[PDB]
């Protein structure tokens, strides 16, 4: 691994004022020559050489160099980069339940918990005269065993044959059985709703397709009513 | 002989309610005293008083509440830094310089999450809590500071039940990226702060989240030659990706926050992932040659940076991950002293408790630790001590020992060190520490235990105290008298008299409300000679039960381990008395806080479980100053940032 | 060791055994009681309640320990409800087959005793046989209170909560009966039966005062009886019916009743005195959180979990017996209702009047198998004898055994010298701990006391599971997370026979009441003199000096589916998974042995 040059071409920019020249120059531009590619660079004619004597030296060792020893080397040309960007891969809502009340001794509120599949925790502060009590936390844990959702797009042109692509999950260890129906509806001209049971294999997934073939335009009503071993639940979906 | 004692605290605090408790002793004919606080230097504005009879029902023992309010005292220019304590009555008139601060009460900001995406609104609210923990009612005004020290928004706004709800800060839809900081701040009059730190991160999604879950999160001896690291990549909640590409690379580093790091550019591997999981191993030993470093002496208190990059087989994606160190430990365990003062009392027994904490601050039991211990008596004589073993246990981690000390003993040089089974001696975790005999004229000690140490004390229930004195002159003491501390104010006091030949005797004390989340209780006796008289004291750190004073409790109706995305629940709140509840549904994924009794214990002045190397040490370090006859202050009022644990 | 191969005498009169220590210039004598080997059988059958022709399957453990004489086998013995005893099998403790019941044999508790060859006790383990059916639902009574006073003027209530076995709730009517019970049989109040509509599984059966006042209006006849409620309760579609019962609410004129008889009757003067009350319920549960005074002291306290609240009084040390009063002072009750008890104590006799005490010091609460717990040896004395002491021998008595025996070294000085006793597992359920001094080679000091480890197991056994739920036929998979080389025993019991019957089943509390009650102590303290300790503790004494303990007298001291596809549940048993596995899975680090079973 890191045949020869790979490991002198980055250590040469390992501690450069223009070592992201140099990363961004190795970069597979399939379509662009080295120079026809290096004319618009505009940062001065030292980011312009850091650039091409990193980018003809790649050119090369793609010639004769094996798939497996140059995606080694796109790891050793990773600390000519600045520092690693703070990113999350996640995305947590909006916090509900974000309000005071007096609560004269005892007191009820309802609400709708909201459409997501995540273990939720509720604390309280109280703040009386007698000083603060934070309370003991609850969770929330809305959690499904088995539960499909569909992955409606959000723009359907008319008259096209849409195939509703839709995956039904199983957290359980013992493979089980399900059916999916679809609500029809006047708009919707599909290809009373028969269960064909279907069988999902324990701790995995199974694609569940429909097709529609949409007619009239505006926004529709498609419930994707998941009846399993436990319940029968609607998912409601809008086209 | 007539003597007396007037109890202060260490520090008055500008707009707090001080109690001042005085106590005299061999008097017959009642009498009054005028506690006052002064100007300084002149003793010419007086800023409150208080009137106390000193009469023969209150077992001549009384208190009066003074306060120095924030409205007479001359800022601006300069702030205020010492007052006069004065006391006079027809039998002593005497006076002490005391400092004061403006630190009055806490502020917790609560922030909703603590990872936030752009465009998302940052929800906060302060609990505004004065110093006799009640609602401030103060305005604050809160300061939102970006990465760049920044002051981006600052929102002001008035308080009225004790929670300050704030308007929600919106994050742009570019933001600057990093650790931002909210500060709260009162407007006037004090300078009372709070922190709370919260980070914007920007929101990429993966075609399939990797993660890299090694081993353990620190590498010493047993990791130093095999290191398994695992790697796990699925696309969703079940979909797992089939065949994919690795690549590892290692790096050593410094700490976590130089990000200059030093790449092995020989320990790259390359390996096939099999339907989600791989286990890879890296031998660190060999693989930190170049850079020598050749021992684990070396590399200490340093990190490893493991990079991967998983590429899909299938659709030729590239998901790339990180670890930002992995901590190279030389020995596994941290030891330190659990509630353990540093102080003798001579012909009395030592009890020291250690705790074996990892080196990320767990409670590791099972753990043998060795304790050797040194006499070095008045003469420079050091004696050696058996030594004695014990094992850690697992609930709290704590090791108990107990020495039984000569009657002579002036200094105790004791080293504990672990005694593990499967590691050298060079990597056993080893402290020493260095305990001092409390020293006093006519050599005459005090020694107070608490009955039920391991367990914490139950509110509404009785302490019972066992006091014993090791005097020359144990005949002649007449009364014990005592003061219980919380929070940094004097809250009881009393007088139990000596049962005249018992050799130690019992004061039973009843746990209140007002000393919650910790107290500590000083007490002491008078023997008196043909000298001047001197007072003997000692003070226990206690440890009573986190019962809030109305205990709220909410729960969720129907209470099910599952519900479904819509249901409508109720959330069922019930307190004890009338109080304003603040509600926060925080998904709890975030968290990968609102520990508040160990910030709010912060108001408490002293530290350590007690004791002190003379009388006026242990009034210094309880968190109390005083005025007597018979000794003297005479304590440096210097900085002094002790880092002493008493919890496990 | 004794071999009982040469005890051949018959059991109705005792054996003693003269103990000869012979050595240079030493020759002792005591002369000791015997008894038998102890050994403790438990039987744990697989339910509570069986059918008649059903086959009863049974297993019975041991606490077996070292000897070489390993033939001792174990009878098991199946007994009529009338006596007639009908199997006597010799088993063997590795796989003994099940008893097959008749088909008309009688309707009753049965018993099983279980007992070694050659020994008198046994251990007894009832079931009933009676033509039932699984009741299909389960019903939780919970009263207002513990107690029913005697004379007062409020009402009875018995909440009902209904639900069915796989946790649904019942919706249907109950029939409650309240009556008074004395000793043996039922008086019951036919003017005070009601009917509650049960809706969503609540609904509560008021008991009026007047009503049960216009029964027994003579007080005298409801001296020290149970009041109970059998509440029947049916659905609404009228399918089945279930009957309970809510026994137990005892007629009492004080909410408390509390007993001495843990704290030691011999003082100290001078020391102060470690005074552990007990308050318990009327039954003999023990209550919590019930704050006892002592008003000749000014000492008060608050009663554990385990219904104990140590005092420390502070003595007059020119005293020979203590009078002391103890009277519970809860919060909310009015004065004329809370207990009260008082005792003396007896000063300890020192060896001629010299005034050498010894006063060892266990004040901690909660000991659990795996503690430090810190025990202090207080002496008092002329200083002159104090100044020639230098080691106290302290020793371990759990189950009528010397455990452990150490010394502990007193330099000089030092009135108040401690130490740190390790709680090993051996300890469990309790254990006493004697220690005494001795000055001028002539006269010995001692004092003892009583400590409650808590009843935990020796080992640990954890099944674990998802905890979620199943479908019928599914697989599922436990782990038995267990000590290293154990031998778990298994059962699955459906829940609707498990609560039907849960009277005769064995648990970890009713395994150490029957090893609690085979030490020879007969207090939890000390004694009147330094023999009286020696005595009390189950211990012997003998001295070159010729001061021995009283003799020991006795062993006791005083569009649809086609139904060619839909399989039809037809498995229905009432127990089953009756297996035993033995752990021989690799311990992990905390020394946990764990295995995973699938079914
Ligand atoms: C940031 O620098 C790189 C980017 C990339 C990137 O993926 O854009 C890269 N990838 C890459 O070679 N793939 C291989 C499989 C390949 C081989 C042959 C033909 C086409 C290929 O690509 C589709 C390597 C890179 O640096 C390696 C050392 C260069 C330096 C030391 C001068
Ligand atoms: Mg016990």
């Not at chain 2, 509440?65 to 005497?94: A, D, M």
């Not at chain 3, 199997?87 to 590795?94: A, F």
């Not at chain 3, 025993?489 to 089943?505: E, F, I, M, R, T």
Request: with cysteine; aromatic share 10%.
């Amino acid at each position: 691994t890191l045949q020869k040059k790979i490991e002198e071409i980055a250590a040469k920019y390992k501690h450069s004022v223009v070592k992201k020249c140099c990363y961004d120059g190795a970069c597979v531009n399939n379509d662009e020559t080295c120079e026809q590619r290096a004319a618009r660079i505009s940062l001065g004619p030292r980011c312009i050489k850091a650039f091409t004597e990193c980018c003809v030296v790649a050119s090369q060792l793609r010639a004769n160099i094996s798939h497996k020893d140059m995606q080694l080397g796109r790891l050793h040309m990773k600390t000519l980069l600045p520092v690693s960007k703070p990113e999350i891969r996640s995305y947590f809502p909006e916090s509900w339940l974000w309000e005071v009340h007096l609560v004269p001794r005892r007191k009820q509120l309802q609400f709708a918990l909201p459409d997501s599949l995540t273990t939720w925790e509720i604390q309280g502060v109280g703040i009386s005269n007698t000083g603060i009590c934070v309370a003991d936390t609850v969770k929330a844990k809305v959690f499904k065993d088995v539960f499909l959702e569909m992955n409606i797009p959000y723009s359907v042109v008319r008259g096209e044959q849409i195939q509703l692509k839709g995956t039904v999950y199983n957290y359980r260890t013992s493979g089980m059985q399900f059916c999916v129906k679809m609500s029809a509806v006047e708009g919707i001209c599909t290809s009373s709703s028969k269960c064909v049971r279907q069988k999902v294999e324990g701790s995995s997934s199974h694609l569940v397709t429909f097709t529609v073939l949409p007619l009239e335009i505006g926004l529709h009503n498609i419930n994707f009513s998941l009846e399993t071993w436990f319940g029968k639940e609607i998912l409601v979906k809008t086209l | 002989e007539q003597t007396y004692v007037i109890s202060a605290p260490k520090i008055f605090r500008v707009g707090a309610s001080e109690n001042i408790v005085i106590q005299v002793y061999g008097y017959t004919e009642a009498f009054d005293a005028t506690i006052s606080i002064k100007s300084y230097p002149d003793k010419k504005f007086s800023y409150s008083s208080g009137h106390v009879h000193l009469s023969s029902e209150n077992k001549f023992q009384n208190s009066a509440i003074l306060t120095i309010q924030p409205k007479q005292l001359p800022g601006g220019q300069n702030p205020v830094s010492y007052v006069y304590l004065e006391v006079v009555s027809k039998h002593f008139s005497k006076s002490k310089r005391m400092p004061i601060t403006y630190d009055n009460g806490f502020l917790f900001i609560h922030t909703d999450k603590p990872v936030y995406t752009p465009d998302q609104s940052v929800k906060v609210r302060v609990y505004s809590l004065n110093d006799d923990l009640k609602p401030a009612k103060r305005e604050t005004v809160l300061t939102f500071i970006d990465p760049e020290g920044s002051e981006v928004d600052m929102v002001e706004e008035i308080d009225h039940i004790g929670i300050i709800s704030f308007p929600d800060f919106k994050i742009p839809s570019n933001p600057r990226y990093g650790m931002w900081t909210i500060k709260a701040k009162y407007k006037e009059d004090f300078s009372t702060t709070g922190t709370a730190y919260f980070e914007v991160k920007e929101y990429v999604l993966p075609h399939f989240s990797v993660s890299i879950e090694p081993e353990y999160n620190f590498i010493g001896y047993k990791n130093f030659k095999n290191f398994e690291i695992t790697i796990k990549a699925r696309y969703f909640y079940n979909k797992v990706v089939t065949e994919a590409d690795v690549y590892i690379t290692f790096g050593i580093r410094e700490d976590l926050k130089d990000d200059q790091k030093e790449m092995m550019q020989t320990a790259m591997q390359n390996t096939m992932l099999i339907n989600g999981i791989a286990q890879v191993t890296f031998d660190s030993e060999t693989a930190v040659k170049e850079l020598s470093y050749y021992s684990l002496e070396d590399l200490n208190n340093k990190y490893l940076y493991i990079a991967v990059t998983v590429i899909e087989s299938t659709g030729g994606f590239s998901e790339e991950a990180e670890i930002p160190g992995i901590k190279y430990v030389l020995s596994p365990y941290k030891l330190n002293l659990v509630a353990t003062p540093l102080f003798l009392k001579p012909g009395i027994p030592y009890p020291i408790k250690v705790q074996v904490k990892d080196s990320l601050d767990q409670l590791v039991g099972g753990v043998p630790v060795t304790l050797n211990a040194q006499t070095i008596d008045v003469n420079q004589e050091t004696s050696d001590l058996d030594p004695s073993k014990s094992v850690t246990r697992v609930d709290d981690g704590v090791a108990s020992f107990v020495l039984n000390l000569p009657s002579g003993v002036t200094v105790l040089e004791f080293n504990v060190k672990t005694d593990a089974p499967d590691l050298p001696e060079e990597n056993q975790a080893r402290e020493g520490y260095r305990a001092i005999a409390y020293s006093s004229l006519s050599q005459s000690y005090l020694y107070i235990d608490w009955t039920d140490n391991h367990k914490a004390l139950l509110v509404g229930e009785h302490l019972n105290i066992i006091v014993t004195p090791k005097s020359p002159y144990i005949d002649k003491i007449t009364h014990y008298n005592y003061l219980i501390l919380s929070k940094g104010k004097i809250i009881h006091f009393g007088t139990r008299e000596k049962f005249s030949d018992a050799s130690y005797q019992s004061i039973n004390i009843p746990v209140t409300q007002n000393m919650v989340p910790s107290s500590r209780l000083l007490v002491y006796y008078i023997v008196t000679g043909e000298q001047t008289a001197e007072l003997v004291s000692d003070s226990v750190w206690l440890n009573i039960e986190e019962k809030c004073g109305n205990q709220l409790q909410v729960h969720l109706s129907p209470d099910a381990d599952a519900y479904s995305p819509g249901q409508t629940v109720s959330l069922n709140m019930a307190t004890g008395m009338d109080s304003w509840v603040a509600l926060a549904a925080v998904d709890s994924a975030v968290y990968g806080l609102e520990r508040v009794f160990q910030f709010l214990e912060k108001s408490d002045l002293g530290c350590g479980a007690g004791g002190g190397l003379n009388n006026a040490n242990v009034f210094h370090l309880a968190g109390l100053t005083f005025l007597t006859n018979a000794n003297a202050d005479d304590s440096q009022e210097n900085d002094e940032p002790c880092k002493e644990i008493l919890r496990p | 060791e004794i071999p009982a191969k040469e005890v051949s005498t018959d059991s109705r009169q005792n054996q003693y055994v003269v103990v000869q220590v012979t050595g240079p210039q030493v020759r002792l004598e005591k002369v000791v009681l015997l008894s038998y080997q102890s050994s403790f059988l438990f039987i744990q059958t697989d339910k509570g309640i069986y059918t008649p022709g059903s086959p009863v399957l049974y297993r019975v453990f041991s606490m077996d320990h070292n000897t070489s004489k390993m033939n001792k086998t174990v009878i098991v013995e199946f007994q009529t409800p009338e006596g007639i005893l009908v199997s006597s099998n010799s088993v063997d403790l590795n796989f003994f087959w099940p008893y097959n019941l008749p088909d008309l044999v009688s309707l009753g508790t049965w018993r099983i005793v279980a007992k070694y060859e050659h020994s008198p006790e046994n251990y007894t383990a009832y079931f009933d046989v009676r033509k039932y059916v699984l009741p299909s639902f389960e019903v939780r009574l919970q009263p207002s209170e513990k107690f029913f006073y005697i004379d007062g003027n409020e009402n009875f209530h018995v909440s009902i909560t209904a639900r069915y076995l796989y946790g649904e709730e019942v919706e249907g009517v109950a029939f409650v009966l309240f009556g008074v019970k004395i000793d043996d049989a039922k008086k019951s109040i036919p003017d005070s039966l009601t009917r509650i509509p049960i809706i969503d599984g609540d609904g509560k059966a008021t008991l009026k005062r007047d009503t049960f006042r216009s029964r027994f209006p003579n007080l005298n006849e409801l001296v020290g009886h149970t009041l109970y409620a059998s509440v029947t309760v049916m659905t609404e579609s009228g399918s089945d019916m279930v009957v309970t019962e809510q026994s137990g609410i005892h007629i009492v004129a004080s909410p408390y009743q509390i007993h001495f008889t843990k704290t030691p009757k011999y003082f100290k003067p001078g020391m102060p005195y470690e005074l552990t009350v007990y308050v318990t319920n009327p039954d003999g549960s023990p209550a919590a959180h019930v704050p006892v005074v002592s008003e000749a002291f000014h000492s008060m306290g608050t009663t554990l979990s385990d219904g104990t609240a140590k005092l420390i009084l502070n003595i007059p040390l020119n005293a020979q017996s203590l009078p002391i009063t103890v009277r519970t002072n809860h919060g909310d009750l009015p004065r004329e209702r809370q207990a009260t008890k008082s005792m003396t104590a007896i000063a300890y006799q020192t060896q001629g009047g010299s005034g050498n005490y010894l006063h060892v010091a266990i004040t901690s609460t909660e000991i659990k198998p795996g503690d430090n717990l810190p025990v202090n040896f207080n002496v008092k004395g002329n200083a002159n004898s104090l100044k020639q002491i230098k080691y106290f021998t302290y020793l371990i008595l759990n189950k009528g055994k010397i455990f452990k025996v150490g010394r502990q070294p007193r330099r000089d000085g030092q009135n108040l010298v401690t130490m740190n006793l390790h709680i090993t597992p051996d300890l469990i359920p309790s254990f006493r701990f004697v220690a005494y001094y001795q000055v001028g080679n002539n006269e010995i000091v001692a004092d003892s006391v009583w400590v409650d480890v808590k009843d935990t197991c020796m080992g640990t056994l954890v099944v674990k599971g998802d905890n979620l739920i199943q479908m019928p036929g599914a697989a599922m998979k436990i782990k038995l997370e267990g000590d290293p080389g154990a031998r778990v025993g298994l059962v699955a019991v459906d829940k609707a026979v498990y609560v039907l019957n849960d009277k005769y089943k064995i648990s970890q509390a009713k395994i150490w009441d029957t090893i609690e009650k085979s030490d020879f102590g007969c207090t939890a303290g000390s004694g009147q003199n330094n023999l009286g300790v020696f005595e009390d503790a189950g211990l012997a004494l003998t001295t070159s000096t010729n001061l021995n303990t009283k003799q020991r007298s006795a062993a006791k001291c005083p569009g649809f589916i086609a139904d060619s596809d839909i399989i039809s549940r037809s498995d229905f048993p009432k127990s089953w998974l009756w297996l035993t596995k033995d752990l021989t899975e690799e311990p992990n680090s905390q020394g946990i042995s764990s295995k995973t079973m699938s079914f």
